[PDB]
From a paper:
For experimental validation, we selected three of these KRT8 mutants ([name], Y54H, and G55A), all of which are found in people with cryptogenic liver disease, as well as three FUS mutants (G191S, G225V, and G230C). Segment crystal structures of KRT858–64 (wild type: SGMGGIT; [name]: [name]) for the wild-type protein and KRT8-[name] were determined. The [name] mutant fibril is a parallel beta-sheet, whose steric-zipper interface is driven by hydrophobic interactions between Met60, Cys62, and Ile63. c, The KRT852–58-G55A mutant structure GGYAGAS was also determined, revealing an anti-parallel beta-sheet with a steric-zipper interface formed by Tyr54, Ala55, and Ala57. d, Alignment of the wild-type and mutant KRT858–64 segments shows a transition in backbone conformation from a highly extended to a pleated beta-sheet at the site of the mutation (circled). Alignment of the beta-strands from both structures highlights that the [name] mutation results in the non-pleated Gly62 converting to a pleated conformation as Cys62 (shown in inset). e, Comparison of the KRT852-58-G55A GGYAGAS segment with a structure from hnRNPA1 whose sequences closely match the corresponding KRT8 wild-type (hnRNPA1: GGGYGGS versus KRT8: GGYGGAS) shows a similar trend in transitioning from an extended beta-sheet in the wild type to a pleated conformation in the mutant. From these fibril structures, we observe that both the [name] and G55A mutations in KRT8 convert a non-pleated beta-sheet into a pleated one, transitioning a LARKS-like conformation into a steric zipper. Suggesting an effect of alcohol on KRT8 aggregation, two of three of our crystal structures of KRT8 segments showed the peptides in complex with either ethanol or isopropanol, each with distinct binding sites.
Although other intermediate filament proteins have been demonstrated to form amyloids, KRT8 specifically has not previously been characterized as an amyloid-forming protein. This protein, like other alpha-keratin proteins, contains a central coiled-coil domain that is flanked by an amino-terminal head domain and a carboxy-terminal tail domain, which are both low complexity in sequence composition. KRT8 is known to aggregate pathologically, primarily in the form of MDBs in liver disease. Atomic structures of KRT8 LARKS reveal that pathogenic mutations convert the non-pleated wild-type protein into a pleated conformation, shedding light on the molecular mechanisms underlying aggregation-promoting mutations in low-complexity proteins.
Residue numbers in the entry:
A (entry chain A), B (entry chain A), C (entry chain A), D (entry chain A), E (entry chain A), F (entry chain A), ...: 58 to 64
The structure:
């Protein structure tokens, strides 16, 4: 249950 | 249950 | 149940 | 149950 | 249950 | 369940 | 379940 | 469940 | 469950 | 569950 943002 | 955004 | 966006 | 967008 | 942002 | 973009 | 874009 | 962007 | 961006 | 950005 993971989320990643490289913005 | 993962989500990834490279913006 | 994954979603990926390379924007 | 996956979805991918390369925008 | 992790989330990462490289902004 | 992989996606790659060389932009 | 892979997708690749060389843009 | 990986995604890569070389921008 | 990895993502990489070389920007 | 790793993410890398070389900006």
């Amino acid at each position: 249950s993971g989320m990643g943002c490289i913005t």
